[PDB]
PDB file of C-alpha atoms and ligand atoms in Angstrom:
ATOM      1  CA  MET A   1      -1.046  14.387   9.730  1.00 24.80           C
ATOM      2  CA  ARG A   2       1.856  13.213   7.201  1.00 27.87           C
ATOM      3  CA  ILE A   3       2.758   9.443   7.489  1.00 28.43           C
ATOM      4  CA  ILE A   4       4.421   6.476   5.399  1.00 29.18           C
ATOM      5  CA  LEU A   5       2.936   3.264   5.310  1.00 33.42           C
ATOM      6  CA  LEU A   6       6.152   0.509   4.914  1.00 31.22           C
ATOM      7  CA  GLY A   7       5.613  -3.313   4.801  1.00 27.18           C
ATOM      8  CA  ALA A   8       5.687  -6.412   2.391  1.00 28.14           C
ATOM      9  CA  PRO A   9       3.191  -7.241  -0.275  1.00 28.24           C
ATOM     10  CA  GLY A  10      -0.033  -8.573   1.725  1.00 32.20           C
ATOM     11  CA  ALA A  11       1.102  -6.846   4.976  1.00 30.83           C
ATOM     12  CA  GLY A  12      -2.392  -5.289   5.229  1.00 32.63           C
ATOM     13  CA  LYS A  13      -1.458  -1.606   4.586  1.00 33.18           C
ATOM     14  CA  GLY A  14      -4.275  -1.216   2.218  1.00 35.78           C
ATOM     15  CA  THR A  15      -6.674  -2.574   4.357  1.00 38.17           C
ATOM     16  CA  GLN A  16      -5.457  -0.488   7.640  1.00 39.26           C
ATOM     17  CA  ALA A  17      -5.118   2.734   4.666  1.00 38.36           C
ATOM     18  CA  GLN A  18      -8.925   2.872   4.983  1.00 36.24           C
ATOM     19  CA  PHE A  19      -9.172   2.753   8.838  1.00 38.65           C
ATOM     20  CA  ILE A  20      -6.905   5.622   9.383  1.00 35.96           C
ATOM     21  CA  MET A  21      -8.537   7.647   6.282  1.00 34.95           C
ATOM     22  CA  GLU A  22     -11.972   7.498   8.368  1.00 33.04           C
ATOM     23  CA  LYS A  23     -10.486   7.466  12.132  1.00 29.62           C
ATOM     24  CA  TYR A  24      -7.982  10.556  11.628  1.00 30.94           C
ATOM     25  CA  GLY A  25      -9.788  12.282   8.381  1.00 27.25           C
ATOM     26  CA  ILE A  26      -6.398  12.551   6.346  1.00 27.27           C
ATOM     27  CA  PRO A  27      -6.214  11.256   2.619  1.00 28.19           C
ATOM     28  CA  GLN A  28      -4.861   8.355   0.859  1.00 27.72           C
ATOM     29  CA  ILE A  29      -2.363   8.419  -1.653  1.00 28.13           C
ATOM     30  CA  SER A  30      -1.886   4.768  -3.178  1.00 25.65           C
ATOM     31  CA  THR A  31      -0.010   4.630  -6.275  1.00 23.02           C
ATOM     32  CA  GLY A  32      -1.133   1.419  -6.891  1.00 21.21           C
ATOM     33  CA  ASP A  33      -4.813   2.749  -6.911  1.00 21.04           C
ATOM     34  CA  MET A  34      -3.906   5.746  -9.202  1.00 22.84           C
ATOM     35  CA  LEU A  35      -1.920   3.538 -11.588  1.00 21.44           C
ATOM     36  CA  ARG A  36      -4.641   0.752 -11.946  1.00 17.53           C
ATOM     37  CA  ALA A  37      -7.115   3.872 -12.238  1.00 18.19           C
ATOM     38  CA  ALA A  38      -4.656   5.502 -15.194  1.00 19.19           C
ATOM     39  CA  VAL A  39      -4.807   1.969 -16.707  1.00 16.57           C
ATOM     40  CA  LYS A  40      -8.616   1.211 -16.481  1.00 16.82           C
ATOM     41  CA  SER A  41      -9.452   4.856 -18.051  1.00 13.72           C
ATOM     42  CA  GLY A  42      -6.444   5.055 -20.588  1.00 12.51           C
ATOM     43  CA  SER A  43      -5.241   7.833 -18.908  1.00 14.68           C
ATOM     44  CA  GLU A  44      -1.893   9.414 -20.357  1.00 13.84           C
ATOM     45  CA  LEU A  45      -0.309   9.545 -17.055  1.00 10.25           C
ATOM     46  CA  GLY A  46      -0.163   6.206 -15.758  1.00  8.13           C
ATOM     47  CA  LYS A  47      -1.700   3.920 -18.587  1.00  9.83           C
ATOM     48  CA  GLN A  48       2.050   2.785 -19.311  1.00 10.75           C
ATOM     49  CA  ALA A  49       2.134   0.593 -15.940  1.00 14.46           C
ATOM     50  CA  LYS A  50      -0.239  -2.136 -17.335  1.00 11.06           C
ATOM     51  CA  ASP A  51       1.807  -4.357 -18.527  1.00 12.06           C
ATOM     52  CA  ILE A  52       4.463  -4.099 -15.967  1.00 13.70           C
ATOM     53  CA  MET A  53       1.970  -4.473 -12.685  1.00 12.06           C
ATOM     54  CA  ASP A  54       0.588  -7.822 -14.164  1.00  9.21           C
ATOM     55  CA  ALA A  55       4.158  -8.600 -14.582  1.00  5.01           C
ATOM     56  CA  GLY A  56       4.951  -7.834 -10.916  1.00  5.55           C
ATOM     57  CA  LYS A  57       7.491  -5.724 -11.857  1.00  3.86           C
ATOM     58  CA  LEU A  58       7.815  -1.902 -10.461  1.00  2.00           C
ATOM     59  CA  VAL A  59       6.938   1.093 -12.282  1.00  2.00           C
ATOM     60  CA  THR A  60       9.881   3.776 -13.059  1.00  2.00           C
ATOM     61  CA  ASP A  61      10.186   5.713 -10.562  1.00  2.00           C
ATOM     62  CA  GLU A  62      10.121   9.091 -12.366  1.00  2.00           C
ATOM     63  CA  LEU A  63       6.425   8.474 -13.523  1.00  2.00           C
ATOM     64  CA  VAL A  64       5.284   7.334 -10.074  1.00  2.00           C
ATOM     65  CA  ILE A  65       7.345  10.715  -8.446  1.00  2.00           C
ATOM     66  CA  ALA A  66       5.112  12.418 -11.136  1.00  2.00           C
ATOM     67  CA  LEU A  67       1.776  11.201 -10.384  1.00  2.00           C
ATOM     68  CA  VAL A  68       2.515  11.337  -6.864  1.00  2.31           C
ATOM     69  CA  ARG A  69       3.748  14.905  -6.963  1.00  3.79           C
ATOM     70  CA  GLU A  70       0.586  15.681  -9.167  1.00  2.00           C
ATOM     71  CA  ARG A  71      -1.666  14.127  -6.423  1.00  2.00           C
ATOM     72  CA  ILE A  72       0.002  15.898  -3.697  1.00  2.00           C
ATOM     73  CA  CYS A  73      -0.497  19.136  -5.279  1.00  2.00           C
ATOM     74  CA  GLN A  74      -4.534  18.753  -5.546  1.00  2.00           C
ATOM     75  CA  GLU A  75      -4.920  18.053  -2.211  1.00  2.00           C
ATOM     76  CA  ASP A  76      -4.911  20.879   0.589  1.00  2.00           C
ATOM     77  CA  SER A  77      -1.690  20.241   2.159  1.00  2.00           C
ATOM     78  CA  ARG A  78      -2.759  20.580   5.645  1.00  2.00           C
ATOM     79  CA  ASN A  79      -5.482  17.912   5.188  1.00  2.00           C
ATOM     80  CA  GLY A  80      -2.530  16.053   5.428  1.00  2.00           C
ATOM     81  CA  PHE A  81      -1.731  12.891   3.425  1.00  2.00           C
ATOM     82  CA  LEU A  82      -1.617   8.514   3.920  1.00  2.00           C
ATOM     83  CA  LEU A  83       0.991   7.095   1.590  1.00  2.00           C
ATOM     84  CA  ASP A  84       0.301   3.909   0.661  1.00  2.00           C
ATOM     85  CA  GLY A  85       2.529   1.886  -1.745  1.00  2.00           C
ATOM     86  CA  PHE A  86       5.032   5.098  -2.042  1.00  2.00           C
ATOM     87  CA  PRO A  87       7.661   5.565  -1.564  1.00  2.00           C
ATOM     88  CA  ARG A  88       8.887   2.305  -2.564  1.00  2.00           C
ATOM     89  CA  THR A  89      12.854   2.790  -3.788  1.00  2.00           C
ATOM     90  CA  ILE A  90      15.338   4.691  -2.205  1.00  2.00           C
ATOM     91  CA  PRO A  91      15.049   7.274  -5.337  1.00  2.00           C
ATOM     92  CA  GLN A  92      11.537   7.683  -4.509  1.00  2.00           C
ATOM     93  CA  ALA A  93      12.188   8.685  -1.156  1.00  2.00           C
ATOM     94  CA  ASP A  94      15.094  11.179  -2.023  1.00  2.00           C
ATOM     95  CA  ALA A  95      12.378  12.632  -4.166  1.00  2.00           C
ATOM     96  CA  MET A  96      10.439  13.137  -1.466  1.00  2.00           C
ATOM     97  CA  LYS A  97      13.426  14.707   0.648  1.00  2.00           C
ATOM     98  CA  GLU A  98      14.530  16.989  -2.365  1.00  2.00           C
ATOM     99  CA  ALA A  99      10.745  18.246  -2.684  1.00  2.00           C
ATOM    100  CA  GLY A 100      10.818  19.350   1.056  1.00  2.00           C
ATOM    101  CA  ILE A 101       8.081  16.578   2.059  1.00  2.00           C
ATOM    102  CA  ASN A 102       8.986  15.628   5.482  1.00  2.00           C
ATOM    103  CA  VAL A 103       6.749  13.060   7.379  1.00  2.00           C
ATOM    104  CA  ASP A 104       5.722  12.462  10.995  1.00  2.00           C
ATOM    105  CA  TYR A 105       5.065   8.956  11.063  1.00  2.00           C
ATOM    106  CA  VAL A 106       6.847   5.754   9.388  1.00  2.00           C
ATOM    107  CA  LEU A 107       4.459   2.548  10.331  1.00  2.00           C
ATOM    108  CA  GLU A 108       6.140  -0.578   9.271  1.00  2.00           C
ATOM    109  CA  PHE A 109       4.186  -3.526   8.888  1.00  2.00           C
ATOM    110  CA  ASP A 110       6.124  -6.278   9.744  1.00  2.00           C
ATOM    111  CA  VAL A 111       4.870  -9.620   8.449  1.00  2.00           C
ATOM    112  CA  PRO A 112       7.193 -13.066   7.955  1.00  2.00           C
ATOM    113  CA  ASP A 113       7.534 -13.974   4.181  1.00  2.00           C
ATOM    114  CA  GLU A 114       5.874 -17.331   5.022  1.00  2.00           C
ATOM    115  CA  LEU A 115       2.196 -15.419   5.095  1.00  2.00           C
ATOM    116  CA  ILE A 116       2.960 -13.206   2.147  1.00  2.00           C
ATOM    117  CA  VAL A 117       1.592 -15.535  -0.547  1.00  2.00           C
ATOM    118  CA  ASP A 118      -1.096 -16.776   0.913  1.00  2.00           C
ATOM    119  CA  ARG A 119      -2.555 -13.362   1.958  1.00  2.00           C
ATOM    120  CA  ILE A 120      -2.293 -12.381  -1.745  1.00  2.00           C
ATOM    121  CA  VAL A 121      -3.388 -15.508  -3.524  1.00  2.00           C
ATOM    122  CA  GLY A 122      -6.565 -15.314  -1.551  1.00  2.00           C
ATOM    123  CA  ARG A 123      -7.118 -11.550  -2.169  1.00  2.00           C
ATOM    124  CA  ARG A 124     -10.287 -10.923  -4.079  1.00  2.00           C
ATOM    125  CA  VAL A 125     -11.450  -7.399  -5.009  1.00  2.00           C
ATOM    126  CA  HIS A 126     -14.549  -5.466  -6.008  1.00  2.00           C
ATOM    127  CA  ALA A 127     -12.575  -3.250  -8.768  1.00  2.00           C
ATOM    128  CA  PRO A 128     -14.992  -0.546  -9.039  1.00  2.00           C
ATOM    129  CA  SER A 129     -15.263   0.148  -5.633  1.00  2.00           C
ATOM    130  CA  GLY A 130     -11.529  -0.885  -4.168  1.00  2.00           C
ATOM    131  CA  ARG A 131     -13.203  -3.072  -1.445  1.00  2.00           C
ATOM    132  CA  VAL A 132     -10.735  -6.016  -0.635  1.00  2.00           C
ATOM    133  CA  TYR A 133     -11.469  -9.469   0.492  1.00  2.00           C
ATOM    134  CA  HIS A 134      -9.717 -12.960   1.486  1.00  2.00           C
ATOM    135  CA  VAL A 135     -11.285 -16.152   1.128  1.00  2.00           C
ATOM    136  CA  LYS A 136     -10.151 -16.973   4.486  1.00  2.00           C
ATOM    137  CA  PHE A 137      -9.033 -14.330   6.622  1.00  2.00           C
ATOM    138  CA  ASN A 138     -11.859 -11.862   5.792  1.00  2.00           C
ATOM    139  CA  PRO A 139     -14.727 -13.244   3.527  1.00  2.00           C
ATOM    140  CA  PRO A 140     -17.451 -11.651   1.279  1.00  2.00           C
ATOM    141  CA  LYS A 141     -20.901 -12.803   2.842  1.00  2.00           C
ATOM    142  CA  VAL A 142     -21.609 -14.555  -0.259  1.00  2.00           C
ATOM    143  CA  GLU A 143     -18.498 -16.376  -2.037  1.00  2.00           C
ATOM    144  CA  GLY A 144     -17.517 -14.381  -4.991  1.00  2.00           C
ATOM    145  CA  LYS A 145     -19.953 -11.785  -4.487  1.00  2.00           C
ATOM    146  CA  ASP A 146     -19.709  -8.061  -3.403  1.00  2.00           C
ATOM    147  CA  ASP A 147     -20.886  -7.390  -0.435  1.00  2.00           C
ATOM    148  CA  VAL A 148     -22.472  -3.991  -1.165  1.00  2.00           C
ATOM    149  CA  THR A 149     -23.539  -4.541  -4.920  1.00  2.00           C
ATOM    150  CA  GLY A 150     -23.525  -8.396  -5.562  1.00  2.00           C
ATOM    151  CA  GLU A 151     -21.386  -8.388  -8.217  1.00  2.00           C
ATOM    152  CA  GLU A 152     -18.631 -11.202  -9.033  1.00  2.00           C
ATOM    153  CA  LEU A 153     -15.626 -10.093  -7.337  1.00  2.00           C
ATOM    154  CA  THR A 154     -12.294 -10.186  -9.180  1.00  2.00           C
ATOM    155  CA  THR A 155      -8.491 -11.426  -8.900  1.00  2.00           C
ATOM    156  CA  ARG A 156      -6.018  -8.816  -9.727  1.00  2.00           C
ATOM    157  CA  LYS A 157      -3.299 -10.288 -12.588  1.00  2.00           C
ATOM    158  CA  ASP A 158      -0.557  -9.673 -10.412  1.00  2.00           C
ATOM    159  CA  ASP A 159      -1.970 -11.786  -7.519  1.00  2.00           C
ATOM    160  CA  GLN A 160      -1.249 -14.671  -9.170  1.00  2.00           C
ATOM    161  CA  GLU A 161       0.879 -16.937  -6.929  1.00  2.00           C
ATOM    162  CA  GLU A 162       4.098 -16.863  -9.340  1.00  2.00           C
ATOM    163  CA  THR A 163       3.978 -13.102 -10.170  1.00  2.00           C
ATOM    164  CA  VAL A 164       3.565 -13.039  -6.168  1.00  2.00           C
ATOM    165  CA  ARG A 165       6.831 -14.169  -5.561  1.00  2.00           C
ATOM    166  CA  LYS A 166       8.665 -12.031  -8.600  1.00  2.00           C
ATOM    167  CA  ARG A 167       6.889  -9.002  -6.342  1.00  2.00           C
ATOM    168  CA  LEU A 168       8.376 -10.784  -3.191  1.00  2.00           C
ATOM    169  CA  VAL A 169      11.709 -10.737  -4.274  1.00  2.00           C
ATOM    170  CA  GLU A 170      11.653  -7.418  -6.106  1.00  2.00           C
ATOM    171  CA  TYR A 171      10.193  -6.188  -2.476  1.00  2.00           C
ATOM    172  CA  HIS A 172      13.457  -7.730  -0.589  1.00  2.00           C
ATOM    173  CA  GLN A 173      15.607  -5.967  -3.456  1.00  2.00           C
ATOM    174  CA  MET A 174      14.160  -2.736  -3.945  1.00  2.00           C
ATOM    175  CA  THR A 175      11.685  -1.764  -1.102  1.00  2.00           C
ATOM    176  CA  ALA A 176      12.599  -3.274   1.873  1.00  2.00           C
ATOM    177  CA  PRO A 177      15.927  -1.309   2.525  1.00  2.00           C
ATOM    178  CA  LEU A 178      13.504   1.796   3.090  1.00  2.00           C
ATOM    179  CA  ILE A 179      12.985   0.217   6.655  1.00  2.00           C
ATOM    180  CA  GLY A 180      16.676   0.686   7.269  1.00  2.00           C
ATOM    181  CA  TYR A 181      16.166   4.154   5.270  1.00  2.00           C
ATOM    182  CA  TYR A 182      13.435   5.922   7.734  1.00  2.00           C
ATOM    183  CA  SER A 183      14.695   3.756  10.732  1.00  2.00           C
ATOM    184  CA  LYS A 184      17.836   5.876  10.045  1.00  2.00           C
ATOM    185  CA  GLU A 185      15.618   9.340   9.637  1.00  2.00           C
ATOM    186  CA  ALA A 186      13.595   8.648  13.045  1.00  2.00           C
ATOM    187  CA  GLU A 187      17.171   7.871  14.304  1.00  2.00           C
ATOM    188  CA  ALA A 188      18.114  11.434  12.976  1.00  2.00           C
ATOM    189  CA  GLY A 189      15.153  13.081  14.991  1.00  2.00           C
ATOM    190  CA  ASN A 190      13.501  13.943  11.479  1.00  2.00           C
ATOM    191  CA  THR A 191      10.473  11.331  11.808  1.00  2.00           C
ATOM    192  CA  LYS A 192       9.235   9.203  14.417  1.00  2.00           C
ATOM    193  CA  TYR A 193       9.048   5.703  13.888  1.00  2.00           C
ATOM    194  CA  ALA A 194       6.905   2.889  14.619  1.00  2.00           C
ATOM    195  CA  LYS A 195       6.729  -1.056  13.916  1.00  2.00           C
ATOM    196  CA  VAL A 196       3.025  -2.865  13.610  1.00  2.00           C
ATOM    197  CA  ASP A 197       2.945  -6.419  14.552  1.00  2.00           C
ATOM    198  CA  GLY A 198       1.238  -7.079  11.054  1.00  2.00           C
ATOM    199  CA  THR A 199       0.007 -10.623  11.869  1.00  2.00           C
ATOM    200  CA  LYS A 200      -2.438  -9.894  14.437  1.00  2.00           C
ATOM    201  CA  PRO A 201      -6.104 -10.080  13.391  1.00  2.00           C
ATOM    202  CA  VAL A 202      -7.332  -6.751  11.864  1.00  2.00           C
ATOM    203  CA  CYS A 203      -9.455  -5.834  14.832  1.00  2.00           C
ATOM    204  CA  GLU A 204      -5.481  -5.398  17.017  1.00  2.00           C
ATOM    205  CA  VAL A 205      -4.100  -4.159  14.391  1.00  2.00           C
ATOM    206  CA  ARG A 206      -6.279  -1.322  14.111  1.00  2.00           C
ATOM    207  CA  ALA A 207      -6.250  -0.819  18.050  1.00  2.00           C
ATOM    208  CA  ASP A 208      -2.536  -0.978  17.693  1.00  2.00           C
ATOM    209  CA  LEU A 209      -2.415   2.107  15.338  1.00  2.00           C
ATOM    210  CA  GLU A 210      -4.758   3.933  17.535  1.00  2.00           C
ATOM    211  CA  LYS A 211      -2.264   4.045  20.328  1.00  2.00           C
ATOM    212  CA  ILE A 212       0.505   4.885  18.181  1.00  2.00           C
ATOM    213  CA  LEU A 213      -1.586   7.731  16.548  1.00  2.00           C
ATOM    214  CA  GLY A 214      -4.103   9.156  18.837  1.00  2.00           C
TER     215      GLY A 214
HETATM  216  N1  AP5 B 301       5.055   3.282  -5.442  1.00  2.00           N
HETATM  217  C1  AP5 B 301       5.101   2.400  -6.888  1.00  2.00           C
HETATM  218  N2  AP5 B 301       6.493   2.471  -7.453  1.00  2.00           N
HETATM  219  C2  AP5 B 301       6.494   1.618  -8.399  1.00  2.00           C
HETATM  220  N3  AP5 B 301       5.680   0.720  -8.802  1.00  2.00           N
HETATM  221  C3  AP5 B 301       4.298   0.904  -8.290  1.00  2.00           C
HETATM  222  C4  AP5 B 301       4.254   1.640  -6.888  1.00  2.00           C
HETATM  223  N4  AP5 B 301       3.181   1.425  -6.577  1.00  2.00           N
HETATM  224  C5  AP5 B 301       2.653   0.906  -7.165  1.00  2.00           C
HETATM  225  N5  AP5 B 301       3.402   0.031  -8.051  1.00  2.00           N
HETATM  226  C6  AP5 B 301       2.836  -0.793  -9.016  1.00  2.00           C
HETATM  227  O1  AP5 B 301       1.941  -1.677  -8.990  1.00  2.00           O
HETATM  228  C7  AP5 B 301       1.858  -2.724  -7.802  1.00  2.00           C
HETATM  229  C8  AP5 B 301       1.885  -3.035  -6.411  1.00  2.00           C
HETATM  230  O2  AP5 B 301       0.482  -2.854  -5.984  1.00  2.00           O
HETATM  231  P1  AP5 B 301       0.346  -2.057  -4.700  1.00  2.00           P
HETATM  232  O3  AP5 B 301      -1.226  -1.422  -5.028  1.00  2.00           O
HETATM  233  O4  AP5 B 301       1.082  -0.745  -4.339  1.00  2.00           O
HETATM  234  O5  AP5 B 301       0.197  -3.117  -3.165  1.00  2.00           O
HETATM  235  P2  AP5 B 301      -0.912  -3.911  -2.920  1.00  2.00           P
HETATM  236  O6  AP5 B 301      -0.807  -4.284  -4.606  1.00  2.00           O
HETATM  237  O7  AP5 B 301      -1.870  -2.772  -3.004  1.00  2.00           O
HETATM  238  O8  AP5 B 301      -0.536  -4.446  -1.857  1.00  2.00           O
HETATM  239  P3  AP5 B 301       0.114  -3.850  -0.537  1.00  2.00           P
HETATM  240  O9  AP5 B 301       1.818  -4.483  -0.953  1.00  2.00           O
HETATM  241  O10 AP5 B 301      -0.506  -2.934  -0.785  1.00  2.00           O
HETATM  242  O11 AP5 B 301      -0.742  -5.204  -0.130  1.00  2.00           O
HETATM  243  P4  AP5 B 301      -1.584  -4.507   1.211  1.00  2.00           P
HETATM  244  O12 AP5 B 301      -0.230  -4.222   2.514  1.00  2.00           O
HETATM  245  O13 AP5 B 301      -2.076  -3.095   1.037  1.00  2.00           O
HETATM  246  O14 AP5 B 301      -2.409  -5.514   2.437  1.00  2.00           O
HETATM  247  P5  AP5 B 301      -3.568  -5.502   1.984  1.00  2.00           P
HETATM  248  O15 AP5 B 301      -4.766  -4.753   2.791  1.00  2.00           O
HETATM  249  O16 AP5 B 301      -4.173  -5.754   0.243  1.00  2.00           O
HETATM  250  O17 AP5 B 301      -3.851  -7.394   2.390  1.00  2.00           O
HETATM  251  C9  AP5 B 301      -3.474  -8.867   1.932  1.00  2.00           C
HETATM  252  C10 AP5 B 301      -4.656  -9.333   1.729  1.00  2.00           C
HETATM  253  O18 AP5 B 301      -4.779  -8.950   3.038  1.00  2.00           O
HETATM  254  C11 AP5 B 301      -5.712  -9.693   3.769  1.00  2.00           C
HETATM  255  N6  AP5 B 301      -5.751  -9.523   5.242  1.00  2.00           N
HETATM  256  C12 AP5 B 301      -5.402  -8.258   5.566  1.00  2.00           C
HETATM  257  N7  AP5 B 301      -5.355  -7.673   6.811  1.00  2.00           N
HETATM  258  C13 AP5 B 301      -5.075  -9.034   7.486  1.00  2.00           C
HETATM  259  C14 AP5 B 301      -4.616  -9.625   8.772  1.00  2.00           C
HETATM  260  N8  AP5 B 301      -4.567  -8.611   9.422  1.00  2.00           N
HETATM  261  N9  AP5 B 301      -4.805 -10.957   8.924  1.00  2.00           N
HETATM  262  C15 AP5 B 301      -5.115 -11.742   7.815  1.00  2.00           C
HETATM  263  N10 AP5 B 301      -5.210 -11.031   6.865  1.00  2.00           N
HETATM  264  C16 AP5 B 301      -5.203  -9.946   6.445  1.00  2.00           C
HETATM  265  C17 AP5 B 301      -6.076  -8.554   3.057  1.00  2.00           C
HETATM  266  O19 AP5 B 301      -8.012  -8.280   3.626  1.00  2.00           O
HETATM  267  C18 AP5 B 301      -6.499  -9.239   1.859  1.00  2.00           C
HETATM  268  O20 AP5 B 301      -6.786 -10.076   2.084  1.00  2.00           O
HETATM  269  C19 AP5 B 301       3.382  -2.535  -7.964  1.00  2.00           C
HETATM  270  O21 AP5 B 301       4.103  -3.606  -7.224  1.00  2.00           O
HETATM  271  C20 AP5 B 301       3.896  -2.332  -8.877  1.00  2.00           C
HETATM  272  O22 AP5 B 301       3.452  -3.136 -10.331  1.00  2.00           O
END
């Protein structure tokens, strides 16, 4: 019902987020989507993240805490949710604690650092639809084209390999301690942890998730 997806950038969280959404009918709350949408439409609550997402840095904890707080207040609460990209720092995890939001599962998408850069530099997306591709690991039917609309695919500005390394460094510094954060909470019986082998093909990763959830 209420689960958190953890993992290094490019571990595959967003890909498996689409599957968990359809299989179990819980909404996907992705801070990356909401910010990129707020920037695209110039929405006051998020448009400020433009220059710093393109730089590969993290958004101020307060700005995403409020956007998540506003997004969770929209949905019907027992529909559940599927957090993808949040929490990303210890203060963001403490915000959910203070706000009385307990989770049922934490799913860790473990992937070696040696795959991270290649997964992200090879990523292409269809921005209007959110569809995600990889040149090698999950390619479109036609090169550079979107499978549904035929429009020329795009590469996100922060998917430049240099910005990726800035992101991978910042992930190890600010976001990786959430693995020990929520593993301690699982050991306290406040949630249920689960590590997932993110190196498998997407077919098997989606199978491993099915066995963990239901
Ligand atoms: N909470 C927050 N607090 C502060 N700032 C925030 C924030 N949230 C967002 N931001 C801001 O904006 C940016 C972060 O961007 P964000 O939108 O949060 O991350 P992505 O950029 O969405 O990165 P994940 O880190 O989400 O990658 P992914 O795990 O979803 O895997 P994916 O399926 O795409 O896969 C990677 C590529 O994977 C390929 N692939 C997928 N699965 C496999 C597989 N199984 N085998 C081989 N290749 C695979 C995928 O198809 C694709 O090609 C933040 O860094 C900051 O700038």
